[PDB]
Amino acid sequence: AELPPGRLATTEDYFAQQAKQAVTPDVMAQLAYMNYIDFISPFYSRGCSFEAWELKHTPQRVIKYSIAFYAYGLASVALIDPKLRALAGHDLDIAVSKMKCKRVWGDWEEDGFGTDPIEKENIMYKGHLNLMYGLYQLVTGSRRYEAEHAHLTRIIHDEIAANPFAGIVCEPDNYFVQCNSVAYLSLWVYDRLHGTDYRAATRAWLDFIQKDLIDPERGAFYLSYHPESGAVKPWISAYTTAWTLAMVHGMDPAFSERYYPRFKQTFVEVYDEGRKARVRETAGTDDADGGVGLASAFTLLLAREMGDQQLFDQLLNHLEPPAKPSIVSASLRYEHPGSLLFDELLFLAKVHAGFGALLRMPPPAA
Amino acid sequence: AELPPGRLATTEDYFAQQAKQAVTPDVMAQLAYMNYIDFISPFYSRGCSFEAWELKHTPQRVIKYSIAFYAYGLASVALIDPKLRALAGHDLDIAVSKMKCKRVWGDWEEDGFGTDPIEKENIMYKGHLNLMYGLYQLVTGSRRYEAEHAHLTRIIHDEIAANPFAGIVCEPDNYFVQCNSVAYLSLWVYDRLHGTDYRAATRAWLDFIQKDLIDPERGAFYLSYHPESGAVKPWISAYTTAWTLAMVHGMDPAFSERYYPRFKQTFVEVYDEGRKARVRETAGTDDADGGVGLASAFTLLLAREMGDQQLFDQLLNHLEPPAKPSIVSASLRYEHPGSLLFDELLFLAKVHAGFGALLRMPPPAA
Amino acid sequence: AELPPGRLATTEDYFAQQAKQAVTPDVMAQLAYMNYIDFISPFYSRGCSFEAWELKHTPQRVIKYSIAFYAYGLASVALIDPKLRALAGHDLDIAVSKMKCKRVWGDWEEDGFGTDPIEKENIMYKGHLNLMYGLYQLVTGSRRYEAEHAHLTRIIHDEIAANPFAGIVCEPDNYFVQCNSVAYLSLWVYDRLHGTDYRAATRAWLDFIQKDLIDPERGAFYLSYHPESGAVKPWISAYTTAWTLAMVHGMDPAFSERYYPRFKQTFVEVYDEGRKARVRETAGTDDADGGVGLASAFTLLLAREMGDQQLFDQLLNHLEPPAKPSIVSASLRYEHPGSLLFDELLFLAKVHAGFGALLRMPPPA
Amino acid sequence: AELPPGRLATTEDYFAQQAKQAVTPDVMAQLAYMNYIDFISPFYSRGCSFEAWELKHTPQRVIKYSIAFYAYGLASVALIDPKLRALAGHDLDIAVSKMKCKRVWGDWEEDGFGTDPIEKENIMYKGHLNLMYGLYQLVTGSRRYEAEHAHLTRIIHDEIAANPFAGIVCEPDNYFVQCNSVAYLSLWVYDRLHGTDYRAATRAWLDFIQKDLIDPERGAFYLSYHPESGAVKPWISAYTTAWTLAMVHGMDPAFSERYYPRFKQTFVEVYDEGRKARVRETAGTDDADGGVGLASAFTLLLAREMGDQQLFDQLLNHLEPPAKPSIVSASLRYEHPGSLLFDELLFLAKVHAGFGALLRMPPPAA
Amino acid sequence: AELPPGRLATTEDYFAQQAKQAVTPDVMAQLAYMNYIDFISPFYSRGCSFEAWELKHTPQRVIKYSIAFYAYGLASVALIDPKLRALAGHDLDIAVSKMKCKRVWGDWEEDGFGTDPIEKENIMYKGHLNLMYGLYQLVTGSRRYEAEHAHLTRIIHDEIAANPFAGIVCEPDNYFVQCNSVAYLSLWVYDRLHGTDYRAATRAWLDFIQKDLIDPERGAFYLSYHPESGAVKPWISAYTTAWTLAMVHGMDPAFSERYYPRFKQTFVEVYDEGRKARVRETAGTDDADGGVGLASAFTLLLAREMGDQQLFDQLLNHLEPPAKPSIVSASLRYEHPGSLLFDELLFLAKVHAGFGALLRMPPPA
Ligand SMILES: CC(C)=CCC/C(C)=C/CO
Numbered sequence A, B, D: 001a002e003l004p005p006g007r008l009a010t011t012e013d014y015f016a017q018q019a020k021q022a023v024t025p026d027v028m029a030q031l032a033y034m035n036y037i038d039f040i041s042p043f044y045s046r047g048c049s050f051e052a053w054e055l056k057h058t059p060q061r062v063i064k065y066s067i068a069f070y071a072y073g074l075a076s077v078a079l080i081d082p083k084l085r086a087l088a089g090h091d092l093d094i095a096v097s098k099m100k101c102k103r104v105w106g107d108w109e110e111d112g113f114g115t116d117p118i119e120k121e122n123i124m125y126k127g128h129l130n131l132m133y134g135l136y137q138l139v140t141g142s143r144r145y146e147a148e149h150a151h152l153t154r155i156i157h158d159e160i161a162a163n164p165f166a167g168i169v170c171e172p173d174n175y176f177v178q179c180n181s182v183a184y185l186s187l188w189v190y191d192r193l194h195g196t197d198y199r200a201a202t203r204a205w206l207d208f209i210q211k212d213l214i215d216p217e218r219g220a221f222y223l224s225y226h227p228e229s230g231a232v233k234p235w236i237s238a239y240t241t242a243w244t245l246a247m248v249h250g251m252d253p254a255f256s257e258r259y260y261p262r263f264k265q266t267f268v269e270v271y272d273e274g275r276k277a278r279v280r281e282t283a284g285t286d287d288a289d290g291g292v293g294l295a296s297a298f299t300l301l302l303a304r305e306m307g308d309q310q311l312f313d314q315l316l317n318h319l320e321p322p323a324k325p326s327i328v329s330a331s332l333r334y335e336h337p338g339s340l341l342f343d344e345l346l347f348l349a350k351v352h353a354g355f356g357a358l359l360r361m362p363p364p365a366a
Numbered sequence C, E: 001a002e003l004p005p006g007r008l009a010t011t012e013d014y015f016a017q018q019a020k021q022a023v024t025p026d027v028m029a030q031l032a033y034m035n036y037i038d039f040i041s042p043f044y045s046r047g048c049s050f051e052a053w054e055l056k057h058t059p060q061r062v063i064k065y066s067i068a069f070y071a072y073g074l075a076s077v078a079l080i081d082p083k084l085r086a087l088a089g090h091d092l093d094i095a096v097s098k099m100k101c102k103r104v105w106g107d108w109e110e111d112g113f114g115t116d117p118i119e120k121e122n123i124m125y126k127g128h129l130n131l132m133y134g135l136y137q138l139v140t141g142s143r144r145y146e147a148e149h150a151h152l153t154r155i156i157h158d159e160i161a162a163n164p165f166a167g168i169v170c171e172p173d174n175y176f177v178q179c180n181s182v183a184y185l186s187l188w189v190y191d192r193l194h195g196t197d198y199r200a201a202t203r204a205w206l207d208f209i210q211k212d213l214i215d216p217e218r219g220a221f222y223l224s225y226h227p228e229s230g231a232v233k234p235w236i237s238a239y240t241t242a243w244t245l246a247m248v249h250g251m252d253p254a255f256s257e258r259y260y261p262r263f264k265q266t267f268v269e270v271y272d273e274g275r276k277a278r279v280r281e282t283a284g285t286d287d288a289d290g291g292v293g294l295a296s297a298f299t300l301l302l303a304r305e306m307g308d309q310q311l312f313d314q315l316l317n318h319l320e321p322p323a324k325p326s327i328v329s330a331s332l333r334y335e336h337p338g339s340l341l342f343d344e345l346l347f348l349a350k351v352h353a354g355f356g357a358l359l360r361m362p363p364p365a
């Protein structure tokens, strides 16, 4: 009912978008920024131009994540607003297309790992690409990428089946649970589009991460796992855990509902007499948003995914006002974005319908 | 016949140039900037030198529109002032020559769309080039570019005939009505120069854009259309609409006269006790000249095409004085151009005799 | 014989140099700048090094004119001062050599016109180079460039013979009278060195520019002509006219004497109680030195060519004092040069013996 | 047991780490800086990415020593904390891997000395790489690099046998005793891993450096030796001596014990009432840390190797506090590092278990 | 007089180095700058690495002179201090090796003169290289470069034999007497090392420059000579003359002793109560160190060569203090070097034992 002094819309309105079958005016102004201006908007063209990311100063290694999080948000826009589904499909088509430019995956070759970014490992890239394939087809019904979707899904499936641990590495001896959660979710999307049972591998993965990679008492994942050396980095990560639990909640709700409360105790800091919240990146500090600086942003998505309106309001009251949003000519801009992936992650959280709902998204109007 | 500060000539003077068969002194001073100084004036050489555009900081993707709009203005100078027809012919020759330099069309290749900018799609470029081919021949009677004109017109004609929708896309699945209107307008020019009836396609296109791409109540076109996904971007665009209605008015005057009064109500903001006007780029905002920033400029051209002297005076009183024109050594310069393509569009609007009149331009000598 | 603030030597002194057989001390200090410091002075080396022009921030397209105007000044230096004739020859050799470096002519290729700078058109370049070939041979007696001189003179002669208009274009459909006057002057120099009569084409050319390209009432040429489209840019150009009249005065003095007074009335503004002058680039304006900014500089050369000491003094009182000349360690420098080609054009005007006098220059016997 | 101002932990705590089987909290925070943040931490990936060194402005020629000194510290972390041994192995794996990127060794080729950095000479590079091969196998027990280890050991051994002087040169005619001490130590590591007696060549080398390259009264080595001309640069070097004695102490302790007290008299300046010390780089000056600026840092390592807790405390009270250390989000940072290789050498000194102990390191098990 | 603010050691100390058989502490600190710090010191490595000159902002065309002048000083360090002779030998080895990198000679190819920097002309480069070959062999006794020394010495000797004038040019028609003086001096070095008599051509060269290239009244050489055009640049050059006289003094002492007094009258300006001196680069000015800015520095070398302790002290009192020397960690640095080649030339002048003394240098046997 109320509007904090730096907010564009209430938490109640964002949560009510799907019920009203319409996005809020500030979410529409974000779509305007994404689509409106010729040449320099990010979703103007399927070509290999990245002026939009250059204007925002996005580091090259992060463009792939920017594109993915836009894509995940567009999928929920499609489910929220039938009137906007066609735009979302058009944007997803451009997203898939840009995701394959060498400007996006080229770091894999620059680092010396090879010329093929999908053949082996590099799950940090092809996991998002594979999920984007499926989200696009669920939204649009187009089979444009169906051959490529089935190819990358088979590659992913075979790689899981061959590893003694459950899941896939990004680089040799570098295993990240959050990147695996994206890959497993893409098997569910494929199963939903086809008749397959690629998701059958999800059980062993949840068992594997639950006994080996998670601190059950604090409800937090460790930074990363290294199978060849049997090592686990001894720090628990807030941004890691929030992302993983958000995507897991769409495959196995009970799993994430068990750790979410313990997770909030470990990392979440409520302040300003309960009106604001910020998130510790790791244990043993009171500093907020260390490391990659995304603990608060990803926790905002997790609260949305978990339906935690109180924490969503508290995190947004910390994130948005200091970023100084403004709407000029019906288009959204942030003057002091507080982190990398800022407008992408706030966009995603405001519209996110939950990864489960995207799995059950209805077919298009044919 | 009053003259406010920063205006160089009255609106009555501009509208009376053709009856007097003489351009106004500030239009002559624009022609001096275009032609006078060795090396750095835009029309000094047919070679691939672009110092003039580098001096103005024209983004590379905009040079093709800068060249084209110069060309369209030069065609009207040819019709206005017989004494200048040879000079305008010479400039048109150089414009066509520069339009073919890689520095002008090269973005098509950088984005990954191919090595031939005219073979498929890319109507945003080859449409203007095709029109310039024809306008050059109407002014001069020279057949220098006649073969290329017949080749590109044939490509345009075949591409229209092959599409299930009426028109041609710029990029795969990106349809822009303003870019199609240039291509359709060029078919009429070819018909005037030869006996052809390539213009027969205009009926289907006017029916198509009227049923799918226009908001009949507000008289405004949507930003863009995307055939593959059947999507239409949900924003109406002033610069899209002003440009399209201006060009359609030379092919079907009744069409543009139908929506013009509603277009003005949707986009045009009169202020300063009726002496000035500025234009919204889209609905739902009071900010003027958002998006690419050309709404007021393109509405100035439309007012010229439509014979709306009052609106023309209001827009020029907003656009020109703040740009600080000065005439030094009989050459026109603006100290603070308010947008991209500024001196090009003000030049064009000041001389524009109407796209219908360019089509019905009398033949040259022999 | 008074010296205004900021002037280095009197107009009477510049005009008296040939009679005294010695250049003024400030012309000597300009040659010092041209020849003195290793590596960075413009006439240090025959190699393709251009440090001197980079230090001056000369636009690349303008380098060719810098070299050519230095050469024209060095040719008069040879005629003025026998003790300096050998040095002028050495400098002319360096000038010709640098003139052929790709850094000087390469714009012809960047602009997409081809890989050969002399084969066809481009008279703006090969015309100056052809004149420099001949002036070099006149100064030194050397035949080092005689072959290249005859080849390019034959190239020019043939291009004239083939055109329905009189002269040669720079780019297709770009005809510049000032660039043609350099080319025609080069035919007289070639004829003077040998016995030929290549200069016979000058009659048709002067007939052509007089009937089509000059406004006889105002004594001023239009900016340019464009044969293919039959167009003439409708602005009269002061720097075009001053340059063209100066060189024509060496081939047909009566021609330039007929228009010079009308040129002064059209473009020249005397001010400061008759002590200064500046030149409007075109009609219909009060601005001085618009366009390329060379109207006053070339009119200074024209006044020298015409023997107009009064106008020369007025123009130099406008051009030099604001540039703040100084002589440091016997070398000339300008703190605020007012235009492109500044030290080159003042150099040329101070020593210029007349293009006709250069044609009749005596051998180094 | 008292804590000097600006210090993070006591000298007693650093020295007590191995007995307590735990690193101090600031050493753990240094490991976090090395491992925590995606992409930009130094040991995130085995790829040829060097963002961490670009952020620190490390000169290209110094990257190889940065990696090596990190490696040596991680080896001691393996001995100190069994709980951290697997992570240390993982980091060592990444270290040798990064060590072989052209960005690290490429100066050998840019300087014109050849295309193969291990073929001949260049002991300043392959000496460290070879030691890293063996330390990785000592820590992890992996034979991953065993083949390359034996290849480079034979190269080194054969090069020693062929020279009339004892050792190997860096660039042609550039002999550096410190770079040789690294290679000889790698021969002992190979001997420990296998049965070999490659270390037998160490006797002739110790005799050679003792009669030709050291000033015996001042306990100091000369800058360098140049076999072709028989020349010895007539300056004694503190950083050269500190490094050489430290590594020699692991092969022949008696040698380093003999010169250490003379080295301290020659170069070390105690000040601030015995609470601090800094090191002169050469004789005949009172300036500290001239030349490469590493005399004090390397002497900190030597005091650690020699067990000199007093000098260690005095040097650390001089180096660390002014560098303004802080711990943010459980990660260590220095606001004003005082030299090259700053956090690398302080890290090594704080954990260093002694080069002899690294040789005698037990296998991983229990 | 004591030690003025900015002087590191007295002139008496520099002149006494050879008698004490030991360099001064500031000369040792210069060698430390040359040898101490890994990677960035100029003589760290024989490879084609030039960080040291990039840090000093040495223009590329001057690196070859920086290396040569370092080498000449290292030759004297070898002769002054036997304890440092092995070091000087090693540095000379590095000097020769770096002298052959394309970064040092590449200007010849960039300017368009060819791909071989020693084949023809370019005496400005191969002259210094040839002297360094020989100086290296005298200091060390090594034949490492002997073949190359014999080949370049034969190239130089043949080119002298073919020219109608005495000497070799740098570029076609660019003759510099100071660059010829390096080349002839290298012939004497070859004669001392072997039995040859290549130096016999020195006589014709001293006759030629004495009659054509020097103003005997002012004791000064003109800037340059141009055989093809018979030209001589009409300015006398202090830096040119000081250098030539210093090197000629080692081959024919009487020649330099005759012109030295007049050179001082022409160029040297004493001031500050006899405690300082600065040098005019050319006649007709009071500005010091015009042109390339090296007149005072080269005159410091000449005073050393001539044994003129008073002028040496006066020049050093002008050159060093303003450059703000300091010794940090036993290494010498100048905060405001006053010219190109600053620490190189002050280094050389402080140690220079005389070119004749280097010619008669004893072996290390
Ligand atoms: C800018 C200067 C000194 C001359 C212009 C000459 C010119 C542009 C001729 C046409 O090609």
Ligand SMILES: CC(C)=CCC/C(C)=C/CO
Residues within 6 Å of the ligand: A038, B062, B065, B124, B170, B176, B178, B179, B292, B294, B341
């Ligand atoms: C930037 C300007 C003057 C117009 C935009 C034209 C455009 C990009 C149409 C779609 O292809």
Ligand SMILES: CC(C)=CCC/C(C)=C/CO
Residues within 6 Å of the ligand: D062, D065, D124, D170, D171, D176, D179, D292, D341, E038, E039
């Ligand atoms: C500058 C640093 C950290 C070490 C010096 C090592 C070296 C240059 C050895 C000889 O090649």
Ligand SMILES: C/C=C(\C)CCC=C(C)C
Residues within 6 Å of the ligand: A062, A065, A124, A170, A176, A179, A292, A294, A341, D038
């Ligand atoms: C291995 C995991 C990754 C590379 C994810 C990095 C995450 C962000 C937000 C840059």
Ligand SMILES: C/C=C(\C)CCC=C(C)C
Residues within 6 Å of the ligand: C038, E062, E065, E124, E170, E176, E179, E292, E294
């Ligand atoms: C031709 C002679 C030369 C190029 C020598 C130049 C001398 C200095 C000190 C730069």
